[PDB]
Structures are given as structure tokens and as C-alpha cells.
Design a protein around this nucleic acid. Structure first.
Ligand SMILES: [Mg+2]
Ligand SMILES: [Mg+2]
Ligand SMILES: [Mg+2]
Ligand SMILES: [Mg+2]
Ligand SMILES: [Mg+2]
Ligand SMILES: [Mg+2]
Ligand SMILES: [Mg+2]
Ligand SMILES: [Mg+2]
Ligand SMILES: [Mg+2]
Ligand SMILES: [Mg+2]
Ligand SMILES: [Mg+2]
Ligand SMILES: [Mg+2]
Ligand SMILES: [Mg+2]
Ligand SMILES: [Mg+2]
Ligand SMILES: [Mg+2]
Ligand SMILES: [Mg+2]
Ligand SMILES: [Mg+2]
Ligand SMILES: [Mg+2]
Ligand SMILES: [Zn+2]
Ligand SMILES: [Zn+2]
Lengths: 69, 91, 114, 135
RNA sequence: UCGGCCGAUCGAAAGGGAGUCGGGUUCAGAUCCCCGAAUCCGGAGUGGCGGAGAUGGGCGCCGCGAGGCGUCCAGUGCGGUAACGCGACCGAUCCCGGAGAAGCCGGCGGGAGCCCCGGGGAGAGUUCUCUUUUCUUUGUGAAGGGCAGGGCGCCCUGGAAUGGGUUCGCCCCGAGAGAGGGGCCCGUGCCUUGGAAAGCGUCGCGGUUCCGGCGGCGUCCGGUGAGCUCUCGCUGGCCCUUGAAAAUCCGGGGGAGAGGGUGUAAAUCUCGCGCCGGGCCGUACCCAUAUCCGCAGCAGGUCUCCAAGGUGAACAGCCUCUGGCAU
RNA sequence: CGCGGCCGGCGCCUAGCAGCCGACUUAGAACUGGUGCGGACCAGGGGAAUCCGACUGUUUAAUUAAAACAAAGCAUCGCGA
């Protein structure tokens, strides 16, 4: 697994051709966006919730947006 | 305190092998395990590695020497003789 | 307490059968079979006993998948010879060649007299 | 007396450029409270010109006569002085000590040493300086 | 033109030898099945995408400046005094070196697992009296990133007797101590992605004759040590004993060559990502007071790994817990 | 003035104190039991001599473990390919 640090790197990671799906896991303290690429599972950790909600609608279309809750 | 009167290093052999054989091996074992002053670096670190092989820990210089002493009295006279014959050979 | 079993069919405490204890997310202790401890290179001088610095110490076949930078040092003979004995070789090479110039000049001025 | 002077050929003993021949540009030998040791600004050659023969041709010879240079500030203990010297007129305003705080200037100084070395490598003078030390 | 493995071949399921772990699942198989996370080797001719190479100066001009045109010249990366560092970092035949690759024993130190102690939970046990009690249980794989911690016979400054530093022991120093500042290696420890979604403990609710069902809560904080067992490291001792080899992989030296005429460029790339493949054989179970040998369900024989509490010097003997059994 | 922080006029633990935490171990004393206390377990009988073999080691698997063999030490012999 790989941990994506800032928001921008996650966007073009999710826009890759080998990105199979993105999973959103809502914990008590953070929201994790996990995109399943060919080699690695890229996880982006968002501390707050407004940025997590903003990222939810900005995801590329045609990609599975499975919610883990 | 001085722990033994006369056996010294061969106290490890106990009562075994005979007094004269222990006395004979005593002076060899002392020179075998002694640390000599290295003639290359000047440090007292030249110690026996194997039989006939003497190695210095500091300059990592390995010398071929005697079995129990760093050099034998045989080889020392030989080196002096070879030097004398070499300076006689040339002029 | 929980007692452990080997996870392979090699049942002897040989050098290739070395294990370490690991706690799994299922809260149990298992053997993890470790890799052998790698060694850094020794200097090509063959004199000083320390191993080289700046080189990752791995098993020899792991070096095939390492990048070039991880296997050498940015210097002449880097990754093959230590820094100390490179400096000595640079000095030894230069001073002996300087001596060759001296002996060549010395015999050249010696042959001026018949 | 003191011999570490500008124009003197030194041998680099440590660093990336170990074993490279080089010329002293400016000796300090007193410290500047930033390098309290004795140091010297040095211009040297990273890549030596290749050997050229008669049966090579003009275009191949000019290709092989190219010199890649470097400029460094070296502690004296990492320099091996030689008896040789080259009177190459390096521009002091271009090759100076404060060239290491701006990469653009360091490129400019390293270019200056390159053109001066190459024209001196031509005409077949200071041949020992431009030969690679074999060690 | 170059080219000696100077000799076929066989020889180890305990030697060498790249790279798989966690959870679930069966009546019987799982590191092999399923789920999820990786990883090694090999291939890509028509070149898969990026990034690197690699894209800067000089002079004439135009242009208010900035910036545009022409010409010429470079450009097989860069930083650090150094140890060395950074994501790549052209290069053949040849040469050099390293790893593979090394005994036994001692004493220390680091780390883990286990044991022990003090609390916080959850569930049980006792309650004739006492016991804020006794018992059980109270996770985070590989592989990445970061940080501790350990080690260094690594570097720089400097020059030490009124010698000093220092170990359990030693031992170290003008061939550079002490001190100050750095660098490297290991990092199995901690945090983080993996990760809680899983697992477990409890309390419930539905049923699909036999649900990886659904749900609530929890999965916490500390302290100790000549403790035991693994492991890592340091430093010694012993030898008329000096404790494999080879596959395989790597680094360096050298520079034969190759690449382009200033182009949104070339040769090249041990850098990031992407694409395809990994065939053959073994794999159940016993491994022994009943699955083996001894004519047999034979008090014999048959190579190993793990290893709790009390007492105690103790892997002793005696009692107990987990697990097992029926003499 | 970043009831808190940068420098300083601002003072003598210098026979060292204050608080907190922590293992086991040793020595000494009192009291005490029907003198019993390494309470089970674990756990050398000792001395004076004589012979042989120096010792440690090995040996007749299935009647002999010995004084037998071996051993270091000592001595002799052959041999320059
Ligand atoms: Mg094997
Ligand atoms: Mg862990
Ligand atoms: Mg074979
Ligand atoms: Mg089974
Ligand atoms: Mg974890
Ligand atoms: Mg020091
Ligand atoms: Mg849960
Ligand atoms: Mg099986
Ligand atoms: Mg039987
Ligand atoms: Mg039979
Ligand atoms: Mg029976
Ligand atoms: Mg009975
Ligand atoms: Mg019965
Ligand atoms: Mg006897
Ligand atoms: Mg006798
Ligand atoms: Mg026998
Ligand atoms: Mg018998
Ligand atoms: Mg006799
Ligand atoms: Zn020496
Ligand atoms: Zn060396």
C-alpha cells in the first residue's frame, strides 16, 4: 500500500487507466479514500469532513465509488 | 595476590603430564601467547595467529615467524649471514 | 502458553531454517522465516578490516534489483575500495612517477661525462 | 616558505573528484570564520580529453578534445600539491569564492574554466596537467 | 578479430540457492482453495506513458521594459571541505575486487516473545464468615514511508604528561586521545498506509432445513528484571586443530565505440507507473508403550522443532494450568 | 507584558539537599513452638595402608571394563624421489 499525502496527487491517481475502484471509509477521526490501482492501494487520509465531502463530488466519473459503511 | 608459587601459566594443566613436561611447555606457552612490539608500526600488538604466522592488529601486517616465538634464533643468524654474503657478493 | 510449530517441512535448526516470532492480526504468534544477514563489501585493498560505507548490506542476489546509487559511492573506486586506501594510492601513484622523473634526470646528467 | 599559491597544480585526494588534477585559483590558508581550516578555491577537470592520434580526422579530434571541468573549494588536507604550475589566466571575477551560492554563476565559472583549459590543451602545452593520473 | 572453467556427466527434500503474507473456509486440503494485501524472475520486435539525459551562454537585431529573430559556442546530471548524498546518471572485449563464504567456547549489551507486578473494562468462580477478591480475556501480517534504538577500525576542527579516556574483563591514543560537530550501516522496535471493513470478548435480534447474517459496546493505561527462550551486536580466549566448494549476483578500473547540431533533439537509463507469463513432480494421514523395524497393537530400537505457575542453584525431583489420557 | 517570555544590576547548594519510584539480597535482634526446623523432594559414609595401571580415553553388541589396548614422553630403524 501507498499513502497519498496531499489532495492533488489523489486526483490524477484516481484518473489513471488502471484505477479499478475507489473506496471511502468513514472513521471516527478521519475519512480515508482508497483507490485500487494495478500495483498499489493508494490511501488518502482527510482529517476534516467538508474537504472529504468536496472530494466525494469531485471524483472522476465511471469509477466505482463503493462506500464502506 | 600471587596465586601460584611456580606453575604460573601451566596451572591449567593441574597435576597432569609431569612436572618437567609442564615446566618445558611453560616457557613455550608464555612466548606463544605473548604480545610483541611490532617492528612496522611500533605498537605492542603483534600476536600469533597460527603456528608460524604473526599478525599485528594495528597495521594489519602479517609476518612469517617461528612456531612459538616471533622470530627464531636460527633465522636471525641466517638474515645476518645472508646480508654479509650479499655485501661480499657485490663490490 | 502458546507453543509454536514450524510452517515448512524442514524440521531441523539449520542455517536456512531460521525464524522469528510474529503476532498476527488474529492475535496469535507464528514463525516468520527470516532472510540471512547480508554483509557490506570489503575493501579491494585487502588491508584494512572495516567494511565499506554507503553501500546497502544485502544478500548477493538482492543486489540485482537495487538501483545503481545504492551499490556504490560517488568517488573513484567507490563501492569497491575504501576512501583511505584510494588516497594512499593517489599519493603512491604520483610520488613513484615523480621518482621515475628524478632517476631519469639523474642518469641523464650522469652520462654527460665520458 | 609557503608554496600553496595561485597557479599551482594540486591533486584532489578526497571527494567526488578524487585523483583529478587541478589548479589553485585562490589560496586562503587562514580561514574566514565559515571555513576555519586552511582552504583554497580550485578549478580542475572532471573529464580528461581523450587520446588523439594522427589517423583520426578533424571532426573526431575536436570531439575528443573536449574537457569537462569543475570548480571547488578544498581543505588543504584534501589536496596534494605538486611541483608543476600552469599560468592559465582564469577570470577572477567569474571564478571567485561566492560563486557557490548561485547555480547560474557556478555554471558560468565552470564554463570559464572549460574554455580556458581547452585552448591551453591545444598547442600541446602543460601536457602533464591534461593527462589522467593512473592509479 | 576476440574467446584456457584445462574438461563430459552425476552427486545434498539438513549445505549454497531470488521472491507470500494476513483473514476465512472442509467430514477429511490449504503459506496451495476464497477474500485482501504484496512480491521475485523473464519478455515486450512493431519501441507503452512519464521523468532523466536536456535543453544555457556570446554577439548582432527588433522590441519602452519584459520578451521575440538570426548566428556562434557548450551541454554522456548535480551537491557536500570530507565521510558521503540526491530518482535516473551512455559505454563493449578485457582486468581487479566483493558477496556467496565459514570452527568451538567465554563475558557483556540492544530488541523481541514469554513470565511477573499495579490499575481500567467484559464475562465467569466463591460468598458459612472474610475477600474493592480469584480466574479468563484485553490484536495488527508482508511490503513501503518516517522516527527511536544499537553499532562503526568513517569524516572535519584541534593537539594531549600534572597523561588522559574507558570495560564486568579489557583496551585505546602525536600512525591524532579527550571534547565539539557530522557521515554511514542495521533497524525484526514504535507510529503510519495496510487497519478494522478483519479477528477476538461480551450483550442481544432475526432467520436461508447448514447465514463469512444483523446490531450494541469494548478491544485501555502503566511498571519491572543477573528472569527464560530466540535474535542482533561488541569484545575476548583456544588450536603442532585455523574450521568447504561451486552455481549465482554485484561493484570498480579502462575507454574500443555510440549518439545531435541547438532540435520540444539523439544515443542511452540500475528512476516512477503501466502490459503479459511462470510449465513439470511431491503435498492426505501416522511419525510411535497401535499406522516405521524387531514374525505381533512386542516394556526394545528409531533424527529433530516449541516449551507455562510454585518450590528450588536448576531443562533436578514433587504438585499444578493449557493440551491429552483411561492405567 | 513575549499573572508569562529575550538580557541583565540581580546570589552562594560547592561537608550537598528536596520529592518520587524501585528490585531482590545479606547481616543483626527480639519473641515463639513438646529441641522441631536442608521436616516431603533433592541430597558425598569416612580414615590408615599394599599391588597394578601415570592421568582423561578405548575394549570382547549377547557371560570377562580389567592390571588388557591407546596415550603423551623416550629410543631405534629406512629413505634425497
Ligand atoms: Mg537447503
Ligand atoms: Mg510489528
Ligand atoms: Mg546435479
Ligand atoms: Mg490437516
Ligand atoms: Mg497496525
Ligand atoms: Mg576523539
Ligand atoms: Mg470490530
Ligand atoms: Mg500434512
Ligand atoms: Mg513398542
Ligand atoms: Mg521382516
Ligand atoms: Mg499396546
Ligand atoms: Mg495398575
Ligand atoms: Mg483397564
Ligand atoms: Mg587406567
Ligand atoms: Mg607411570
Ligand atoms: Mg563399547
Ligand atoms: Mg560382553
Ligand atoms: Mg619414562
Ligand atoms: Zn604493527
Ligand atoms: Zn583499505
Amino acid at each position: 500500500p501507498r499513502k497519498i499525502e496531499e489532495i492533488k496527487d489523489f486526483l490524477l491517481t484516481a484518473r489513471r487507466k488502471d484505477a479499478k475502484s475507489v473506496k471511502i471509509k468513514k472513521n471516527k477521526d478521519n475519512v480515508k479514500f482508497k483507490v485500487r490501482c494495478s500495483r498499489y492501494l493508494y490511501t488518502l487520509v482527510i482529517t476534516d469532513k467538508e474537504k472529504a465531502e468536496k472530494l466525494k463530488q469531485s471524483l472522476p466519473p465511471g469509477l466505482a465509488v463503493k462506500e464502506l459503511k | 595476590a600471587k596465586r601460584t608459587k611456580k606453575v604460573g601459566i601451566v596451572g591449567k594443566y593441574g597435576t597432569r603430564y609431569g612436572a618437567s613436561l609442564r615446566k618445558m611447555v611453560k616457557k613455550i606457552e608464555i612466548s606463544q601467547h605473548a604480545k610483541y612490539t611490532c617492528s612496522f608500526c611500533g605498537k605492542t600488538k603483534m600476536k600469533r595467529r597460527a603456528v608460524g604466522i604473526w599478525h599485528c592488529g594495528s597495521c594489519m601486517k602479517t609476518v612469517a615467524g617461528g612456531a612459538w616465538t616471533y622470530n627464531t634464533t636460527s633465522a636471525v643468524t641466517v638474515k645476518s649471514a645472508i646480508r654479509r654474503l650479499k655485501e661480499l657478493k657485490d663490490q | 502458553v502458546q507453543r509454536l510449530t514450524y510452517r515448512r517441512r524442514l524440521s531441523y535448526n539449520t542455517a536456512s531454517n531460521k525464524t522469528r516470532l510474529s503476532r498476527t492480526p488474529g492475535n496469535r504468534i507464528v514463525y516468520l522465516y527470516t532472510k540471512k544477514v547480508g554483509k557490506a563489501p570489503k575493501s579491494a585493498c585487502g588491508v584494512c578490516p572495516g567494511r565499506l560505507r554507503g553501500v546497502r548490506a544485502v544478500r548477493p542476489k538482492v543486489l540485482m534489483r537495487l538501483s545503481k546509487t545504492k551499490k556504490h559511492v560517488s568517488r573513484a573506486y567507490g563501492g569497491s575500495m575504501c576512501a583511505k586506501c584510494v588516497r594512499d594510492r593517489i599519493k603512491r601513484a604520483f610520488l613513484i612517477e615523480e621518482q621515475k622523473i628524478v632517476v631519469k634526470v639523474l642518469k641523464a646528467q650522469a652520462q654527460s661525462q665520458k | 616558505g609557503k608554496f600553496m599559491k595561485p597557479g599551482k597544480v594540486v591533486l584532489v585526494l578526497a571527494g567526488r573528484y578524487s585523483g583529478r588534477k587541478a589548479v589553485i585559483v585562490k589560496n586562503i590558508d587562514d580561514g574566514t570564520s565559515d571555513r576555519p581550516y586552511s582552504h583554497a578555491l580550485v578549478a580542475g577537470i572532471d573529464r580528461y580529453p581523450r587520446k588523439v592520434t594522427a589517423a583520426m580526422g578533424k571532426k573526431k579530434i575536436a570531439k575528443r578534445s573536449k574537457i569537462k571541468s569543475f570548480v571547488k573549494v578544498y581543505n588543504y588536507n584534501h589536496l596534494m600539491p605538486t611541483r608543476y604550475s600552469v599560468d592559465i589566466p582564469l577570470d577572477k571575477t567569474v571564478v571567485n569564492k561566492d560563486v557557490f551560492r548561485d547555480p547560474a554563476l557556478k555554471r558560468k565559472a565552470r564554463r570559464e574554466a572549460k574554455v580556458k583549459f581547452e585552448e591551453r590543451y591545444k598547442t600541446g602545452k602543460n601536457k602533464w596537467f591534461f593527462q589522467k593520473l593512473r592509479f
